[PDB]
Design a protein around this nucleic acid. Structure first.
Lengths: 188, 260, 140
RNA sequence: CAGGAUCUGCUUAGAGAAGGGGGCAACUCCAUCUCAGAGCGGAGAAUUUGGACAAACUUGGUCAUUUAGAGGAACUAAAAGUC
RNA sequence: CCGGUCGGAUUUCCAACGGGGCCUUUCCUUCUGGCUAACCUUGAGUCCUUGUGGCUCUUGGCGAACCAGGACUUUUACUUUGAAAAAAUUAGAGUGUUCAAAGCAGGCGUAUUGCUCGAAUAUAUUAGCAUGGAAUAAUAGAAUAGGACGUUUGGUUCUAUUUUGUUGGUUUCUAGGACCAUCGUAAUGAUUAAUAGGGACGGUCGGGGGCAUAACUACUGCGAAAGCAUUUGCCAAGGACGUUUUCAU
RNA sequence: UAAUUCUAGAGCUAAUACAUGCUUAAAAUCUCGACCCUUUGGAAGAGAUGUAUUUAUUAGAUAAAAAAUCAAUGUCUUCGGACUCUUUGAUGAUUCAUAAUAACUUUUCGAAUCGCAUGGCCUUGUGCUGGCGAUGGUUCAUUCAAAUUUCUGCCCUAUCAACUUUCGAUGGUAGGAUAGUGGCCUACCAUGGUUUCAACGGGUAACGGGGAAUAAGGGUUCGAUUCCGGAGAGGGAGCCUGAGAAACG
RNA sequence: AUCUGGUUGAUCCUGCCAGUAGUCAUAUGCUUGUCUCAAAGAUUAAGCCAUGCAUGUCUAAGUAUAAGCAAUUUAUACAGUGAAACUGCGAAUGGCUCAUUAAAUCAGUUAUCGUUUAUUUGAUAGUUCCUUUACUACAUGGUAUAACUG
């Protein structure tokens, strides 16, 4: 199969090497799993030792994370816009690490009103007792709420789905978002 | 190969066991256990090549199955269980108690001890770490882990272990001027005291040890086993007491002693 | 300049909170290498991002220590060191010269032109043919 | 990527509708003759879509050999006629 | 030498042979902490002729042994000693297998419920590691001084360990990092000039070469070699000698 | 069925096989918040917290002193609020061990097993407790291991002087794959890397070392073969079961 | 730590060809009485192979209604022995050959802060009915097949 030996390449000189042994099981590769979007299909493979890995063949949800507030909720994912390795994964919508997708913004907005009581865009006495407490921490960055009219955020993936099975990540913020948005609307 | 190996040939057996090179073709191979392979001694080299009690292999299994032989207050029947340094071998139908400790020319010596010294055991300190749920432990040279120690213990110190409950009575630090046994290398089995210890960052540290007759030598740090403060060990030492005798000095000391 | 590559570049797991405000530039992270080596000035307050640097990246230094003269700087973030010795031939009672080239890695904290003489230490495999990177420098 | 020979636990109609009480007469009551209905499930063989890994085959084009004869030209003998 | 004697002491001195130590214009280059002994400081305890005597108690100066942070400092070759280079085999110590090659055994008493010695030591033999020495042979340092020392003075910075119990919100010092002019003292700082080499310089010498216009030829002339002979003039080259010139191949 | 360690249909019953599934101390701390009527409020009730899986974000201190300050408070209240208040492992070196906060999951593990003995307590119920040990179990350490990797070292040959880079050759950035690092593979970019101190190619009737024969000293010639390391099972390729094999009884 | 024969009528040299010993170095020729110790299908063909063997395994302690035996007896669940078969573990060790392979193997020497590990030895687990004890067993839930009969 796919082997990871260095005994088939050339030296730093250029001298062609020689066939030394047959191919050994403890240097093997497997097949690349491409991860589409759809209903949950996850298959399990058996590794060195008695361990276990979960290959994800297609999934549709995830578990994403708001950094600056420090809350991580479970949402759905929609589609990939940008991939820095080759752009044949954006035209097929696979799922790797460092892929930039769009999520639906609904449970973060529904959390935001519960935590503060202030809208996005445009009655027990316990509530305003503590809503008055969280007063100074109310406003956020302009350029991130400015997509809550459409419910499509920008988020990158930080979990390897072919190994761990899952697909999680984190929301783009303004320093990093300034880079990618200049990259997003100019390279097309 | 493909898996582990399971035979030991006769000439590849460790030299200080003194198997004679014509009786067979393989040697006993020691099981996986507390002490390392080339630093230990199975229970068949003890009970038929040292004490001369048994005359076969078939006689040793007949001794072990009658549940006589213990190590450290626990019964063993593994016919190649690996007894190593500082272990206590308590037979019962003779009321003898042994302790494994080094000779001077580099061998494992037969040593009889009392019935009260056979209630405890030293052991050095190989690492000290913080375990799961925030408790600490300590690892000895034979592999015992012991949770909840004193904080003043550091690595390369020496603990004293009570073999009954598996617990700690007291401990000895590691600094200049202590009594020290040497458990590996060339000056193997000599006893002396610490002059000082220089350190190399990212390397192997060297101690300088003075004898009692005031002649000095140098070994690496890990072949050094603390025993007690000066003039006062915690264990019953063998004859000679770790004094290196030159070969000139031990012909005539055998000559004049030859009066029988 | 420091953002030329096609993906965003950062010392990972180093978070900037935009809600707070502090007049520092960015929370840079930096370590002490060991063995009595001194982290240079241009790494603690510099602005490069490099994955493979001893004072900033996630590599350790342990193993050997070598020394040699630099003979080619035509790659991007690697150089080539020449080392020279002698070799004894017992029948003829004499010596003969030999040499070996080693390639190492250069953090952008250092500025190395040809002809100098560096000292280098060993890290885990970095490329196909690379296992050292520079840790000190002295000029020509 | 599909495919579904075959097993299968189920819910639930419901008439077949059997025997005891109640128009006691089918029947109706939980006191059981013989079954057509569907409702969601699970396990899963033969066969088939695209890959990577690849032993071999065919075909000429080149070499090395061999081998069969083939055509060669020379020198020499317990070989030898001569100008 | 001395023996001194009911071979080993040596009262005790000598010759060499190797080793420390200080002093001579002169070796670790230091710093902060403990830290231990030790000289001493306000000064007695301690006990000996009575003591700021030391020993050592108290404050206080220190060198002095050890740990820990350092603090900075050209780099090799070679050589000395160490750790670490499996057993078997090789050199080899002990030991009547009946001798031997081998083997690692064996020996002793009452043999009557026994004690007891062994299974050594050597063989860096490249490369790596620890350490002692400074001969031999390389290598770096101040020449346009951005040179070295200064507790000359003006600066620019950057950290806040601390205290304003504590907390967060400010800046005042203070220490604590570097860089910034000019002001002071040191004897301020450049190895000889190879009966090595190159370069000038002055008078000469030669059938040396190019353009133009025999005899003298051995006894000896010139050129890297093959080679080189009529006079006159041009064009450049070259050895040796001479010299209190120059560069440091 | 001529046949081989070939097997079909019908009928029974077990498990440490296969598939499910309960039990249990108290404490604390969080969020929600019925009410309450109020100042500066305090509250019933509710739920959440083992370990393992995946992602994000905090703690993981330490070089030397003192104020002014913005308020808040522990406290004698001195109703001024001045103060009468902190712990922190290991390494030459870490984003290390380890802990917390939000969550997440074709929800992992947390004894429906077996032999011996047979006792103590009672309201005497087959009531309640109770000995020695076999086998299984999650994670950290440990032992037997395994996989890669740093420095220096190989016989003859110039009648082999230039070789490697489409088809990865040398480096950079991001993914894929693996037990894991790495051009190991895939994308976009740079134009590198080896060489008269012999690269690259050709020969070997070449497995490498410990070692063997000969020996004044230096050396010449051997090592298929009792020990350790690698490779192979008629020749190439592929995979199943397993902690471990690209295995050939 | 050693040398002798051979060029010329005669002598001194350069120089090679015979000689002389050793071999754990293989065959071969003629002989051959004793004790101790013992290599042995490597070279050529890593060519081809008739027959038999070389890997299986049970304790008081995972599963017995053998239509097994022993019967012998306190034992109406079973209890002595014990074929066959399921389950567990091992078959990856050992033994044999030297074809490939010239910076590869391999040696002495480092590294894992870059990873997997049955076993062995030592520690290690009140939280898991919807629940804090509300329907729905913990004095204990469900099928399926092997040997065997036909």
């Amino acid at each position: 199969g796919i082997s990871r030996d260095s005994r088939h390449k050339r030296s730093a000189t250029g001298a062609k090497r020689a066939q030394f042994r047959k191919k050994r099981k403890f240097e093997l590769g497997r097949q690349p799993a491409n991860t589409k979007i759809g209903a949950k299909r996850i298959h399990s493979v058996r590794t060195r030792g008695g361990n276990k890995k979960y290959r994800a063949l297609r999934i549709e949800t995830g578990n994403f994370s708001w950094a600056s507030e420090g809350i991580s909720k479970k949402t759905r994912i929609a589609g990939v816009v940008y991939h820095p390795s080759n752009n044949e994964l954006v035209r097929t919508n696979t799922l790797t690490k460092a892929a930039i997708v769009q999520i639906d913004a609904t449970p973060f907005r529904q959390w935001f009103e519960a935590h503060y009581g202030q809208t996005l865009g445009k009655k027990s006495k316990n509530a305003e007792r503590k809503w008055a407490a969280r007063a100074a921490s109310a406003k956020i960055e302009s350029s991130v709420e400015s997509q809550f009219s459409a419910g499509r955020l920008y988020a990158c993936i930080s979990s390897r789905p072919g190994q761990s099975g899952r697909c999680d990540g984190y929301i783009l913020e303004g320093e990093e978002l300034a880079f990618y948005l200049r990259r997003l609307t100019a390279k097309k | 190969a493909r898996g582990p190996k399971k035979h030991l040939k006769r000439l590849a057996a460790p030299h200080h066991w003194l198997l004679d090179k014509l009786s067979g073709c393989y040697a006993p191979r020691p099981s996986a256990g507390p002490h390392k392979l080339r630093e230990s001694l199975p229970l068949i080299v003890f009970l038929r090549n040292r004490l001369k009690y048994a005359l076969n292999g078939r006689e040793v299994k007949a001794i072990l199955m009658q549940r006589h032989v213990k190590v450290d207050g626990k019964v063993r029947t593994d016919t190649t269980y690996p007894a190593g340094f500082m272990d206590v071998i308590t037979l019962d139908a003779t009321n003898e108690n042994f302790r494994l400790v080094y000779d001077v020319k580099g061998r494992f010596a037969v040593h009889r001890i009392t019935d009260e010294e056979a209630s405890y055991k030293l052991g050095k300190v190989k690492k000290v770490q913080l375990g799961k749920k925030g408790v600490p432990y300590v690892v000895t040279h034979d592999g015992r882990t012991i949770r909840y120690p004193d904080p003043n213990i550091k690595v390369n110190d020496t603990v004293k272990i009570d073999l009954a409950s598996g617990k700690i009575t007291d401990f000895i630090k590691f600094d200049a001027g202590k009594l020290v046994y040497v458990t590996g290398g060339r000056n193997l089995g000599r006893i002396g005291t610490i002059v000082h210890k220089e350190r190399h960052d990212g390397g192997f540290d060297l101690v300088h040890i003075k004898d009692s007759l005031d002649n000095t030598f140098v070994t690496r740090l890990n072949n050094v086993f603390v025993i007690g403060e000066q003039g006062k060990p915690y264990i019953s030492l063998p004859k000679g007491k770790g004094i290196k005798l030159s070969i000139a000095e031990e012909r005539d000391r055998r000559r004049a002693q030859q009066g029988l | 300049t420091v953002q030329s590559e096609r993906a965003f570049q950062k010392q990972p797991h180093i978070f900037n909170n935009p809600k707070v405000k502090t007049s520092k530039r960015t929370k840079r992270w930096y370590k002490n290498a060991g063995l009595g080596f001194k982290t240079p000035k241009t790494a603690i307050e510099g602005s490069y991002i490099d994955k493979k640097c001893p004072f900033t990246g996630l590599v350790s230094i342990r193993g050997k220590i070598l020394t040699g003269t630099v003979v080619s700087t035509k790659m991007h973030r690697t150089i080539v060191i020449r080392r020279a010795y002698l070799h004894y031939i017992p029948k003829y009672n004499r010596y003969e010269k030999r040499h070996k080239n080693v390639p190492v890695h250069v953090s952008p904290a250092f500025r190395v032109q040809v002809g100098d003489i560096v000292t280098v230490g060993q890290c885990r495999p970095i490329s196909k043919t690379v296992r050292f990177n520079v840790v000190k420098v002295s000029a020509a």
